[PDB]
Amino acid sequence: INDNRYINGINQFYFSIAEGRNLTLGPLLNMPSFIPTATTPEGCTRIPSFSLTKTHWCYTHNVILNGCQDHVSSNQFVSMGIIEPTSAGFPFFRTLKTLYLSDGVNRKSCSISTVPGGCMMYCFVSTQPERDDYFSAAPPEQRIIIMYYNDTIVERIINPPGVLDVWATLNPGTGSGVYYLGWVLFPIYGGVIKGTSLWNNQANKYFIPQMVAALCSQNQATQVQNAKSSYYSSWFGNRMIQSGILACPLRQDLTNECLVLPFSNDQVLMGAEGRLYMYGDSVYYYQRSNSWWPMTMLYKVTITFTNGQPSAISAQNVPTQQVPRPGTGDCSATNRCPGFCLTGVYADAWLLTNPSSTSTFGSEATFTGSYLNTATQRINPTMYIANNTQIISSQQFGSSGQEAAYGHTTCFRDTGSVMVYCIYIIELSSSLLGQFQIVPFIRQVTLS
Amino acid sequence: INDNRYINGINQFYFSIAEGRNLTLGPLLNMPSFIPTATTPEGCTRIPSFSLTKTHWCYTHNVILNGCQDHVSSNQFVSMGIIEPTSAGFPFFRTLKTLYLSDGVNRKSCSISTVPGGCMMYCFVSTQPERDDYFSAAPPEQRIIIMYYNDTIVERIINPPGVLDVWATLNPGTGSGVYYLGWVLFPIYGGVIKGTSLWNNQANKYFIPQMVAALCSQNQATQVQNAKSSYYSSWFGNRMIQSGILACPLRQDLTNECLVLPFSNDQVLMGAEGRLYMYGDSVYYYQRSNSWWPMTMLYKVTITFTNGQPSAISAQNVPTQQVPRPGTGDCSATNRCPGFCLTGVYADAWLLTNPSSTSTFGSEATFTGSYLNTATQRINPTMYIANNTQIISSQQFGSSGQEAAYGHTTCFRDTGSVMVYCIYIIELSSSLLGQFQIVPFIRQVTLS
Amino acid sequence: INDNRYINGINQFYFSIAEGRNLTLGPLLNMPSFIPTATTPEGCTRIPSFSLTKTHWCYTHNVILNGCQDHVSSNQFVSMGIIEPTSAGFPFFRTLKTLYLSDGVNRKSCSISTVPGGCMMYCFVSTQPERDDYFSAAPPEQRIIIMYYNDTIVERIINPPGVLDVWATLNPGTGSGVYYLGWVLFPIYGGVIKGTSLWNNQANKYFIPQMVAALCSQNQATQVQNAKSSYYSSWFGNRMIQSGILACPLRQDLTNECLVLPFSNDQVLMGAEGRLYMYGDSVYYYQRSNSWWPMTMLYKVTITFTNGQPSAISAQNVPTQQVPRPGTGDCSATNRCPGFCLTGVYADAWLLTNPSSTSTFGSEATFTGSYLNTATQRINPTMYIANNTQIISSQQFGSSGQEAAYGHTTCFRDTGSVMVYCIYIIELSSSLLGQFQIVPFIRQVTLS
Amino acid sequence: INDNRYINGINQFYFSIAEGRNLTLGPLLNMPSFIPTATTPEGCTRIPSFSLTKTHWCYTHNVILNGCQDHVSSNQFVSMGIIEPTSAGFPFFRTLKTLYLSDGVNRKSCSISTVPGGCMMYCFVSTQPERDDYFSAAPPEQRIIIMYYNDTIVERIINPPGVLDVWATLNPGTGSGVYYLGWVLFPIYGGVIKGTSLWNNQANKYFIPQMVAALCSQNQATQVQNAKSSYYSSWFGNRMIQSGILACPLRQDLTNECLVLPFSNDQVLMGAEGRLYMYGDSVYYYQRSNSWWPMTMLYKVTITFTNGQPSAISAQNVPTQQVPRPGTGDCSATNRCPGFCLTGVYADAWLLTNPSSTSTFGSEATFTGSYLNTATQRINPTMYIANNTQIISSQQFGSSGQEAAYGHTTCFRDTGSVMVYCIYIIELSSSLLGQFQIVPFIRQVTLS
Ligand SMILES: CC(=O)N[C@H]1[C@H]([C@H](O)[C@H](O)CO)O[C@@](O[C@H]2[C@@H](O)[C@@H](CO)O[C@@H](O[C@H]3[C@H](O)[C@@H](O)[C@@H](O)O[C@@H]3CO)[C@@H]2O)(C(=O)O)C[C@@H]1O
Ligand SMILES: CC(=O)N[C@H]1[C@H]([C@H](O)[C@H](O)CO)O[C@@](O[C@H]2[C@@H](O)[C@@H](CO)O[C@@H](O[C@H]3[C@H](O)[C@@H](O)[C@@H](O)O[C@@H]3CO)[C@@H]2O)(C(=O)O)C[C@@H]1O
Ligand SMILES: CC(=O)N[C@H]1[C@H]([C@H](O)[C@H](O)CO)O[C@@](O[C@H]2[C@@H](O)[C@@H](CO)O[C@@H](O[C@H]3[C@H](O)[C@@H](O)[C@@H](O)O[C@@H]3CO)[C@@H]2O)(C(=O)O)C[C@@H]1O
Ligand SMILES: CC(=O)N[C@H]1[C@H]([C@H](O)[C@H](O)CO)O[C@@](O[C@H]2[C@@H](O)[C@@H](CO)O[C@@H](O[C@H]3[C@H](O)[C@@H](O)[C@@H](O)O[C@@H]3CO)[C@@H]2O)(C(=O)O)C[C@@H]1O
Ligand SMILES: *[C@H]1O[C@H](CO)[C@@H](O)[C@H](O)[C@H]1NC(C)=O
Ligand SMILES: *[C@H]1O[C@H](CO)[C@@H](O)[C@H](O)[C@H]1NC(C)=O
Ligand SMILES: *[C@H]1O[C@H](CO)[C@@H](O)[C@H](O)[C@H]1NC(C)=O
Ligand SMILES: *[C@H]1O[C@H](CO)[C@@H](O)[C@H](O)[C@H]1NC(C)=O
Ligand SMILES: [Ca+2]
Ligand SMILES: [Ca+2]
Ligand SMILES: [Ca+2]
Ligand SMILES: [Ca+2]
């Protein structure tokens, strides 16, 4: 279990609104990396997922032997452990168990979550290029693997209701899932088939971030028209790209008990990868900006239970215009107008302040993470701290031109020294070993 | 415990003399690295030690937060696990436990060894520059830490007899130790004080490798004179630089039961770092070439027991003129004449063939490892396979100029597929994260 | 069920057009044969049928106690199991159930197919020499046996419509059938009676392979005339030798629900033995060359359903001039001109590349299998890989003169190691035990 | 379970003394072989073990990929099933489960035995040439694997008392073991160390078959002297070559509960491979003639229990001078005089008549099996029926010169047709597939 210094400083809003204004990033600290490196120049390690809870943490990433493209073979590395203080005062992520799922099943886009006594991981089995998944009416095989600290492993092929003949494809968001009221929730996304109930119930719905008006040159009527069209992709089999949550009861004999809960397209942007968080008793969702709006998307999620089962989810966006992501064409970091984009990168963010602490939800919110500081290239990885409109602290890593990709950020507090540490898991392009080197950067978020 | 595919292919001579002539190195294979990376540009990870036995493996290395120099603080990372096959057929070193000794004790030059149920590590506590250790008549504190797989940890300060007032300094060789007949043996080296019994019993002794004559331009009398002087260092407090073995009985209450067994200087070169191996029931020793002879030094060690206690060791050298190491001045890779050098690098080698299988010990021996292919710079890391006089297979890693340091090589056979794999743990200079990135390269040694 | 290493590498085109050009056959690998041997010098085991699907495989062959000729007694051996990896990396066909249909019913020319939970086998009951079957206006009794993995066995005598008074004889093609959209499809062939609707609707129809013109010395008008006559056999009761497909709904009370679907003689050659395959969602058919064209015949089959029932089939030939088969007289492997032949051997082929991946269907197709390399004798069994015009890789088995007969080839990929294996089931003439020894040769199809 | 036609005709003496005089071998019958064949010319399948009991049968053999020599890798094929009648009246060994132990553990000289609900197999792990096993004072690892029909598999490393420091080596006899009064008994053999209690208690003991006197030209005193020396092998590490029985209680957590019971050297010849049988409630033992006496050795074994545990075994030889085996030098099939031989072949025999039915034990005994009819070569496999002094029925298989090796014979009666069938499992040298083809020949033993 995690050291006494951290058990009470996990999954919480660490600073008050007033303190958020005076936060800065401290130097990067050196700790032994718990994320394994490739041992060949061409080896590819990508798509990390990290879950940290009161008792322990779970980590995983995909491994492809040659290059970063394969719709046939790949392995998935899983790791779990605890956090303990070093003589210098900062954290050391102590790995207590390692697993390497290597058996011919092409498990991809995996999301992992901490569960009592272990980790629960959700993946889909890839057997063809992603685009092909959207055209085929049949969805890929879905799997949830439970790995207990006592080395017992139980993998199940799941068939949640409302998936077959509704979703042409379904993928975990790769971002961490969360254990909530006895259920494990994972972010999901995919393409819905035209004519289905879901498609019809979503017809004419759209979402436009609160701060777009002041930045978009198009009029309200034009924005609305373009936003509605941003949820449909002709390139991806003419499917409605949908975001949602997969709720699975913690059982070892899962079959069709997991529930697919899609977000209303009136509250969320075009479906994309994502991540779920827990701040106190509140669930939050991060949605990758793979559509027209290039800014960080965070939402407070309200989950409704009907007869002990999740029945519906509602999302309230934290309005911001900060931390853009690189995109292609008319969907770069400089875009502000609705339309149809299918480009971007995964770059989640951690809320250091409570959005509900202000009279108007999210009026003054502070968050931290990493982002690729450029308009269209996946370059210049930069760790930051920002509020709704400005970056109040940042530090680029490496020299300009340094390639990078996804960035998963997680923060926790040392209740002993009373300092907050954040880990920024970034996929860095390396010139020595492997295509990428996933690095768990760690530093303090200083108040002052 | 290790998979059934490896339990019977560990610590053995894998090939016959005839087969050794047709061995070649296969491509590097990609597996998840079990050696942790630094998370800052200046973080320093160095001095690895690796022990692999029938049941499991032990790994460790030193971590310094800023740069690679400190005689005050540093931490020591320890790891242990097993080997299991991947769907591609090659090994995956599965970490089952991690430890980070971080408490203010500056444990350095640590050597680790597998023991039933865990790992035994031997370190010395550094409190001043190395050179200062040789001048002070008092030796550094010595410690042996036993770490059981059941998480029990027992550290002891040891005071073996014949150390105080004999050795001005004493260090573990950093190379792996071995569990032999109930005792854990570790390679050691240091400086002996003038006038001591050890010094006197070693007076006028010297060792000259069998293949030096044909390569040295000096006459026999001159070589003998210079060789005798190569065991004394005026730069290192005028001490006799000695190599040896530390034998510790496997106990949890060690105090003065470990025994310091020095090698006769008539059979070994000037003391240096080293490593111990087990090939069947035979113990072997690798001695870093930190003196005048720049070639790989391997010896078969014969241990004598008197009343259940190791009482003396004898070493028989495997005569070679292959695989040189970079050195400074008149002690570079091109040197062949006796004299006093105090320069070189650690680069052990694994014997793929049995030296005793030939009528004349070591007449035709084959070994593998890595070496820095250059005369004086620690550059061009190159993995190879060689016999007594030639390199019969090699492959440089990275582009010329690539900096590197130590190299620990270990081989084992998959008794299922019947192929031999070797792991080459090399300290590589990295430009992205940390001063060095210790990489566990792995590839096959192909027969044909 | 099959190991995770194979469940996703079955019934697919494994290579791209570009990769097909660089394919070669690896050494034969040794695995325990799952095909039973005879225990007497005269015992005869022949006519194998093999079906491999995602979950498991089904195998069967005919057993005659004395010699290879009997129109009265014979037994049929059935076997089923899964595929799992060996420590050497290659497959082991693990038999999980064996059955020996020995009860006096002379079941012949059986074709077998995998079905959910078991195997479905289709045979006809022989009671007289084959030639006699064509002269008698009454067709032989037809039977389909379902054998579930739970040991339940259900055999039914079927009477599909349009058989009585239309087909003088009807036989399964012996090649595997396939489970498609809830129906089990089997290849069939036989002789149709003059004056029947089928006969009339087939009148004046003929098929000439695309690559015959350039190789045949006869003019177009003469070729057309001879091709039309190749579908009628005076030796076989003056019947129209027809090829087709038998579609049976997966039920345990089959009576007259199976449907006989003949191929149009404008798209297929004279009826003969055959086999059905599944490549993704596409059905393919292999037609033994028992007529004038001695080259491998493969067709993509398009099945039309009318009210949930197969109503018609269409075949598109993959144009080739490669891999001939031994024949008698003016119908040997060297023949190229239309006429009436009734000679040849069964030698199916597996498509390693997708014929539809080229702008012009089958313009560049690659396939593998075995063939008897000789003009008129059933001799020199040779495994190969070939494209439309040339054999790009081959290896004869045994010494010249080695007798053999049928060859059933099936390939699948290990999604773990990412290699393709093909099994070549060949009837080999043996000098020790039995007339023939049906051997499941297995080797890899290497890319490079 | 076995068909009703065989459940009551297993493990019994089938004929009376009077009927034994009129027994003859019927033609070989053709049934589908349940023993798997190799699929490469060099593949090697050898060392079969077969156990047949009231409910079912167990079968196993060793598989080496290249040639028949390896002290590192090999796999072990296991099979189990039942017996059922065919329409022709004779047996069909129906395989209901197959297993292929392929994981890097070099399991050799395995003996298998039927147990309620499955099979228990006993093997030793080879890691060096056989001769080396006798010189090393440490015995090879011993393992017993239980394989239940419900697919549960439990393998255990056993350490029976009195093995370490007593037996330099220990091997299962490869012949079948038997389930007796809740214990599984396996034949064993190996080399005992000089000076051990076993060695001392065996000192000066020897056994000379009752019918040697009349055939040996040496006098009684000389025979006795030479016989005593035949139990010690200087070629095999100067060990006393011992035969015995390993008794294991049927448990799934075996550790040190199995008991090593050596035969008194006053009742048995030099240790060798062997087999255990059950005839009614009596245990019998077959001992390979690897010493000076080249004739078939069968003994009735009396087992003594002390506190529910086997405590001692006694053997009574069935005196014969029939069915010799090929041997080397002065130990060929023509030898009759005591001395030290270490040559021969495994060729067990089944007793068709009860040796205890005669006033003088074994005065008139009849048995059947196969033997290599030649003086020194492993050639001319011949199935027979013989009494103490003559072969009363025989039939060679193949043409003279045909190579073969071991032969395991098992007989049982069809209580329906009232006929006895015997299966002769013979390792035949094949020219087509594999080094050997282990064939389960089957025929009737006719009374008349
Ligand atoms: C299931 C899957 O493939 N997931 C990948 C995701 C998804 O593509 C994303 O969530 C949208 O569905 O994203 C990642 O893959 C992208 C990456 O390989 C980049 C590299 O340039 O290319 C993207 O594809 C572009 C393509 O390059 C364009 O030419 C055009 O075809 O549009 C596509 C849009 O997808 C990949 O999607 C990612 O790195 O962000 C990784 C996940 O494996
Ligand atoms: C206890 C200890 O310091 N161990 C280090 C060893 C020992 O120095 C070696 O076994 C000989 O006693 O070696 C390592 O350290 C050397 C490394 O830092 C190099 C880098 O250039 O410098 C060596 O020192 C040189 C120095 O650079 C010269 O100017 C001159 O003073 O000679 C000294 C000789 O020691 C370090 O010894 C090593 O990397 O090989 C690392 C161990 O920590
Ligand atoms: C139902 C049946 O008999 N099937 C057999 C098939 C069919 O004959 C084939 O699909 C054409 O209808 O083919 C196999 O049998 C042939 C084989 O026994 C060879 C051996 O030489 O002889 C063929 O018959 C020849 C005969 O030898 C000629 O003299 C002349 O009469 O023509 C006939 C043509 O049939 C057998 O057909 C086969 O091995 O290919 C086996 C099937 O059992
Ligand atoms: C554990 C083991 O090796 N078992 C093998 C047994 C034993 O050798 C036998 O029980 C005596 O200990 O026997 C088998 O192996 C023999 C076979 O390979 C023959 C082939 O010629 O050679 C025998 O070795 C001879 C050798 O050829 C001679 O030159 C001289 O060295 O004597 C040895 C005597 O052992 C093998 O033992 C067998 O086939 O009978 C097979 C078992 O694997
Ligand atoms: C943060 O710093 C500002 C600037 O000096 C100070 O005025 C403010 O009180 C601090 N914020 C709080 C309340 O911690
Ligand atoms: C290795 O290769 C050589 C060169 O062809 C060959 O002659 C030799 O027999 C091989 N070595 C052995 C004995 O494995
Ligand atoms: C196959 O080999 C050829 C010959 O070197 C090479 O040029 C080609 O690129 C390879 N085919 C592919 C694309 O895999
Ligand atoms: C066996 O055959 C002999 C020879 O005819 C006959 O005399 C004898 O009675 C038979 N044996 C018995 C008793 O079955
Ligand atoms: Ca789909
Ligand atoms: Ca000192
Ligand atoms: Ca008919
Ligand atoms: Ca031994």
Tokens of B23: 């061995």
Q: Record the tokens describing residue C120, joined without a space.
A: 């479905």
Ligand nearest to the CA of A15: 5
CA-to-CA distance for D156 and D159, rounded, in angstroms?
10
Q: How far apart are CA D258 and CA C325, in angstroms?
A: 61
Tokens of B376: 């004086």
How many other CB atoms are found less than 10 A from the CB of residue B148? 17
Residue D288 CA: which ligand 4 atom is closest? 10
Nearest CA to B291 out of B316, B273, B269 is that of B269
| Gap from C357 CA to chain D (nearest CA, Å) | 35
Quick count: other Cβ atoms within 10 Å of Cβ A41?
Answer: 15
Q: Which residue of C has its CA nearest to B5?
A: C87
CB D125 within 8 A of CB D172: no
Chain D nearest-CA residue for C425: D39
Tokens (6 digits) for B163: 């150390």
Report d(CA A258, CA A264) in Å as an integer. 19
Number of H helices, E strands in chain C: 4, 26
Angstrom CA distances, B11 to B49, B84, C52, C294, stand at 16, 17, 43, 59
Cβ neighbours of A200 (radius 10 Å): 10
Question: How many Å lie between the alpha carbon of A71 and the closest alpha carbon of chain C?
Answer: 10
Cα–Cα distance for residue pair D229/D223, rounded to 1 Å? 10
Q: How far apart are CA D243 and CA D262, in angstroms?
A: 6
Question: Which of D40, D42, D52, D176 shows the shortest CA–CA distance to D109?
Answer: D176
Beta-carbon contacts of D2 under 8 Å, excluding residues fewer than 6 positions away, are: D10, D54, D55, D56, D57, D82, D83, D84
Write the CB contacts of A311 (distance below 8 Å, at least 6 apart in sequence): A261, A304, A305
Count of CB atoms within 10 A of residue A393's CB?
A: 18
Helix or strand (DSSP H, E) at C384:
strand C381-387
For residue C96, with 0-12 CB atoms within 10 Å meaning exposed, 13-18 middle and 19 or more buried, which class applies? middle
Contacts from A222-227 at CB under 8 Å and sequence distance 24+? Answer: A223/A337, A223/A338, A224/A338, A226/A292, A226/A337, A226/A338, A226/A339, A226/A340, A227/A292, A227/A338
Nearest ligand 3 atom to the CA of C62 is: 43
- Give the list of residues 6+ apart from residue A346 with CB closer than 8 angstroms, or none: A174, A175, A273, A288, A405, A406, A407, A408
Three-state SS string over chain B comes to: CCCCCCCCCECCCCECHHHHCCEEEEEECCCCCCCCCCCCCCCEEEEEEEEECCCCEEEEEEEECCCCCCCCCCEEEEEEEEEEECCCCCEEEEEEEEEEECCCCCEEEEEEEEECCEEEEEEEECCCCHHHHHHCCCCCEEEEEEEECCCCEEEEEECCCCCCCCEEEEEECECCCEEECCEEEEEEEEEECCCCHHHHHHCCCCCCCCCCCCCCCCCHHHHHHHHHHCCEECCCCCEEEEEEEEEEECCCCCCCCCEEEECCCCCCCCCCCEEEEEECCEEEEEECCCCCCCECEEEEEEEEECCCCEEEEEEEECCCCCCECCCCHHHCCCCCCCCCCCCCCCECEEECECHHHCCCCCCCCEEEEEEECCCCCCECEEEEEEECCCEEEEEECCCCCCEEEEEEEEEEEECCCCEEEEEEEEEEECCCCCCEEEEEEEEEEEEC
Kindly provide the b/e burial profile for residues D375-386, where b requires at least 16 CB atoms within 10 angstroms of the residue's own CB.
beebbbbbbbbb
CA C285 – CA C297 distance, rounded (Å): 8
Residues with CB under 6 A from ligand 1: A 47, 109, 130, 171, 272-273, 290, 342, 345, 405
Beta carbons of C8 and A103 less than 8 Å apart = no
Residue in C5, C87, C418 nearest the CB of B5? C87
Per residue in A99-121, is it b (16+ CB within 10 Å) or e — as a string? bbbbbbbbbbbbbbbbbeebbbb
**D305 SS3 class:** strand
Look up residue C234 and give its DSSP letter: T
- Secondary structure (3-state) at D221: helix
Q: Distance between CA atoms of A38 and B74, rounded to whole angstroms?
A: 26
Q: Say how far apart CA C277 and CA C300 lie, in whole Å.
A: 9
**C-alpha of residue D131 to centroid of ligand 4, in Å:** 9
Nearest to B5 among D103, D125, D127 (CB): D103
Name the residue facing D72 among B6, B7, B418 (closest C-beta). Answer: B418
Question: D125 with D144: CB under 8 angstroms?
Answer: no
Give the separation between CA D153 and CA C31, rounded to whole angstroms. 22
* Residue D225 backbone phi and psi in degrees, to 5: -65, -45
Half-sphere exposure of B77 (CA within 13 A, CB side): 30
* Residue of chain B whose Cα is closest to the Cα of D127: B8
**CATH number of the B1-448 domain:** 2.120.10.10
Which of ligand 5's atoms lies nearest the C-alpha of A22?
1
Burial class (CB in 10 A: 0-12, 13-18, 19+), D351: buried
C432–D434 CB contact, under 8 Å: no
Return d(Cα C54, Cα C7) in angstroms, integer. 5
Find, among B237, B241, B212, B240, the residue nearest to B224 by Cα.
Answer: B212
Domain boundaries of chain B, sorted by first residue: 1-448
B125, B136 contact by CB (below 8 A) = no
Q: For residues B1 and B81, what is the distance between their CA atoms, to the nearest angstrom?
A: 8
Asked whether D227 and D213 are in contact (CB, 8 A), the reply is no
Q: What is the DSSP string of C186-203?
A: EEEEEEEPTTSHHHHHHT
What Rg, from alpha-carbon coordinates, does chain B have? Answer: 20
Residue owning the nearest CA to atom 14 of ligand 6: B19
Closest CA to D315 of D362, D348, D347: D362
Cβ-based neighbours of A2, under 8 Å, separated by 6 or more: A10, A54, A55, A56, A57, A82, A83, A84
Distance CA A250, CA A256 (A): 13
- C356 Cα: distance to centroid of ligand 1 (angstroms): 26
Q: At D7, is the secondary structure helix, strand, or coil?
A: coil
Listed residues: CB within 5 A of ion ligand 12: D 133, 136, 168-169
Cα separation, A99 vs A123, in Å, equals 15
Resolution (A): 2.5
Cα B202 from Cα B264, distance rounded (Å)? 7
D219 Cβ contact partners less than 8 Å away, ≥ 6 residues apart: none
CB C380 within 8 A of CB C400: yes
Q: Whose CA is nearest to atom 1 of ligand 5?
A: A22
φ, ψ for residue D317 (rounded to 5)? -75, 145
Cα of A19 from ligand 5 centre, angstroms:
7
Tell me which H or E stretch contains C135: helix C130-135
Spatial contact of D136 and D165, defined as CB atoms under 8 Å apart: no
Does the Cβ of B403 fall within 6 Å of ligand 2?
A: no
In sequence order, the β-bridge partners of residue A242 are A190
| Distance between C86 CA and the closest CA of chain D, angstroms | 6
Q: How far apart (Å, rounded) are the C-alpha atoms in residues D421 and D425?
A: 13
Alpha-carbon dihedral angle through residues C171, C176, C181, C183, given to the nearest 10 degrees: 30
**Torsion B98-B104-B109-B111 (CA) sign:** negative
Please state, in angstroms and rounded to a whole number, the distance separating the CA atoms of residues A122 and A173. Answer: 9
Could you write out the DSSP letters of every residue in C30-86?
-----SPPPSSSS-EEEEEEEEE-SS-EEEEEEEESSSS--SS--EEEEEEEEEEE-
* CA–CA distance, D182 with D149 (Å, rounded to integer): 18
CA-wise closest residue to C55 among C151, C149, C124:
C149
Alpha-carbon dihedral angle through residues A253, A256, A258, A263, given to the nearest 10 degrees: 170
Bridge partners (DSSP) of residue A286 are A275, A298
Q: In whole angstroms, what is the distance from residue C323 CA to residue C298 CA?
A: 12
Q: Find the residue in B nearest to A27 (Cα).
A: B40
Distance CA C297, CA C275 (A): 11
Our CA-based measurement puts residue B115 at a distance from the nearest CA of chain A, in whole angstroms, of 20
Q: B437 Cβ partners below 8 Å, 6+ apart? A: A37, A432, A433, B37, B38, B45, B427, B428, B430
With beta carbons less than 8 A apart as the criterion, state whether D157 and D142 touch: yes
Instruction: Residue C8: list chain A partners with CB under 8 A.
Output: 72, 104-106, 125, 127
Chains with ≥3 CB–CB distances under 8 Å to D: B, C
Question: Cα of C359 to ligand 9 centre, how many Å?
Answer: 25
The encoded tokens of residue B357 equal 């299988």
Q: Which residues of C touch D77 (CB under 8 A)?
A: 32
The minimum-distance atom of ligand 2 relative to the CA of B124 is: 1
- Helix then strand count (H, E) for chain D reads 4, 26
Q: What span, in angstroms and rounded, lies between the C-alpha atoms of A4 and C240?
A: 87
Contact C386/C372 with Cβ under 8 angstroms?
A: no
Three-state DSSP class for C18? helix
Look at residue D104 and give its three-state secondary structure.
Answer: coil
CA-nearest residue to B84 within chain C is C87
The two structure tokens encoding residue A203: 């017809």
Please give the C-alpha separations between residue A48 and each of A187, A368, A437, A442, D21, in angstroms, as whole numbers: 14, 18, 11, 16, 80
Contact C142/C164 with Cβ under 8 angstroms? Answer: no
Interface contact flag, D37 C437, Cβ < 8 Å: yes
B423 DSSP β-pair partners: B410, B442
CB contact under 8 A, B88 and C416: yes
State the DSSP H helix or E strand holding residue C113, giving kind and residue range, or none if neither: strand C107-115
Structure tokens at D58: 């167990």
Task: Using CB atoms, pick whichever of C30, C100, C430 lies closest to residue D40.
Answer: C30
Count of other CB atoms within 10 angstroms of residue C22: 12
Helix H, strand E, coil C: the string for chain A is CCCCCCCCCECCCCECHHHHCCEEEEEECCCCCCCCCCCCCCCEEEEEEEEECCCCEEEEEEEECCCCCCCCCCEEEEEEEEEEECCCCCEEEEEEEEEEECCCCCEEEEEEEEECCEEEEEEEECCCCHHHHHHCCCCCEEEEEEEECCCCEEEEEECCCCCCCCEEEEEECECCCEEECCEEEEEEEEEECCCCHHHHHHCCCCCCCCCCCCCCCCCHHHHHHHHHHCCEECCCCCEEEEEEEEEEECCCCCCCCCEEEECCCCCCCCCCCEEEEEECCEEEEEECCCCCCCECEEEEEEEEECCCCEEEEEEEECCCCCCECCCCHHHCCCCCCCCCCCCCCCECEEECECHHHCCCCCCCCEEEEEEECCCCCCECEEEEEEECCCEEEEEECCCCCCEEEEEEEEEEEECCCCEEEEEEEEEEECCCCCCEEEEEEEEEEEEC
- Gap from CA of D252 to ligand 2 centroid (Å): 57
Residue type, B70: D
How many angstroms separate the CA atoms of B197 and B203, rounded? 10
- CB hemisphere CA count around C333 (13 angstroms): 17
Measured CA to CA, the distance from residue D178 to residue D247 in angstroms comes to 10
Chains B and D touch (3+ CB pairs under 8 A): yes
Burial of D438 per CB tally in 10 Å (0-12, 13-18, 19+): buried
Secondary structure (3-state) at D226? helix
- Give every strand in the sheet of D419-429, ordered side by side: D23-28, D436-447, D419-429, D404-414
Whether B7 and D104 lie within 8 Å, measured CB to CB: yes
Q: Are D421 and D446 in contact (CB under 8 A)?
A: no
> What CA–CA distances, in Å, run from A108 to A103, A257, B30, C414?
13, 22, 18, 18
Spatial separation of the C-alpha atoms in residues C111 and C152, rounded to whole Å: 19
In contact, D283 and D15? CB cutoff 8 Å: no
DSSP states along D366-388: EEEEEEE-SSSSSB-EEEEEEES
Any bridge partners for residue D190, and if so which? D170, D242
User: What separation in Å is there between the alpha carbon of D188 and the centre of ligand 12?
Assistant: 15
**Hey, what amino acid is at B40?**
T
* Secondary structure class of D10 (helix, strand, coil): strand
B58 lines ligand 2 (CB under 6 A): no
Residue ID of nearest Cα to ligand 3 atom 2: C130
Minimal C-alpha gap between D133 and chain B (Å): 14
Ligand 12 centroid–CA D163 distance in Å is 11
**Which chain B residues are within 8 Å of A105, Cβ to Cβ?**
none
Ligand 2 pocket check for B171: Cβ under 6 Å: yes
**Measured in Å, how far apart are chain A's first and last C-alpha atoms?**
32
Which method was it determined by? X-ray
Q: For residue C301, count other CB atoms closer than 10 A to its CB.
A: 22
Token pair recorded at residue B389: 């006089």
Residue nearest to atom 38 of ligand 1 (CA): A345
**Max Cα-Cα span within chain D:** 61
| Dihedral, CA of residue C109, residue C113, residue C115 and residue C121, to nearest 10 | 10
What is the spatial distance between Cα D423 and Cα B366, in angstroms, rounded to a whole number? 52
Closest CA to D425 of D61, D86, D94: D61
Residue A427 and residue B231: Cα distance in Å, rounded?
50
What residues contact D149, with CB distance under 8 A and at least 6 apart? D56, D80, D96, D97, D117, D118
For B35, which residue in chain A has the nearest alpha carbon?
A36
Report the candidate in C359, C429, C444 with the shortest Cα–Cα distance to residue C38. Answer: C429
Q: Of the candidates B345, B344, B346, B362, which has an alpha carbon nearest to the alpha carbon of residue B354?
A: B362
